[PDB]
Amino acid sequence: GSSGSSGDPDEDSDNSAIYVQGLNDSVTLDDLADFFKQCGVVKMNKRTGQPMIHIYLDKETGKPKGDATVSYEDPPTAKAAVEWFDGKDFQGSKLKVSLARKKPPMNSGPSSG
């Protein structure tokens, strides 16, 4: 109970990227760029004009295992996009979106072992 509102607390998850997991073996960048953009706008390079989306491909065959990452412009969009695509259905497969950089604080963090 202090006098005067000197700045209010809020989620400072600078992380504006999201980690997707559950993509098919036929998923393409453009396919993820046009979809991930559903929520907001996907950080598009100003020099290459390409989306900041990554699609890890199995070094065994070269196909997209299913995991990927989408870097959004601002955090406000990334955090909103996570719960947006989190649990979506791509080509019949379930997608799992989660802020790449996610970790619990220290205060009241651990409970037991």
Swiss-Prot record:
Modification after translation (UniProt): Highly methylated on arginine residues. Methylation is mediated by PRMT1 and, at lower level by PRMT8.
Compartment annotation:
Nucleus; Cytoplasm; Cell membrane
Residue span, RRM domain:
16-102
Summarize tissue expression. Answer: Ubiquitous.
What does the sequence similarity comment in the record state about its family?
Belongs to the RRM TET family.
Q: What pathology does the entry list? A: Ewing sarcoma: A highly malignant, metastatic, primitive small round cell tumor of bone and soft tissue that affects children and adolescents. It belongs to the Ewing sarcoma family of tumors, a group of morphologically heterogeneous neoplasms that share the same cytogenetic features. They are considered neural tumors derived from cells of the neural crest. Ewing sarcoma represents the less differentiated form of the tumors.
Assembly and binders? Binds POLR2C, SF1, calmodulin and RNA. Interacts with PTK2B/FAK2 and TDRD3. Binds calmodulin in the presence, but not in the absence, of calcium ion. Forms a complex with REC8, PRDM9, SYCP3 and SYCP1; complex formation is dependent of phosphorylated form of REC8 and requires PRDM9 bound to hotspot DNA; EWSR1 joins PRDM9 with the chromosomal axis through REC8.
Role played:
Binds to ssRNA containing the consensus sequence 5'-AGGUAA-3'. Might normally function as a transcriptional repressor. EWS-fusion-proteins (EFPS) may play a role in the tumorigenic process. They may disturb gene expression by mimicking, or interfering with the normal function of CTD-POLII within the transcription initiation complex. They may also contribute to an aberrant activation of the fusion protein target genes.
Domain note:
EWS activation domain (EAD) functions as a potent activation domain in EFPS. EWSR1 binds POLR2C but not POLR2E or POLR2G, whereas the isolated EAD binds POLR2E and POLR2G but not POLR2C. Cis-linked RNA-binding domain (RBD) can strongly and specifically repress trans-activation by the EAD.
Q: What protein name is recorded for this chain?
A: RNA-binding protein EWS
Q: Which residues of the full protein are shown?
A: 353 to 453 of 656
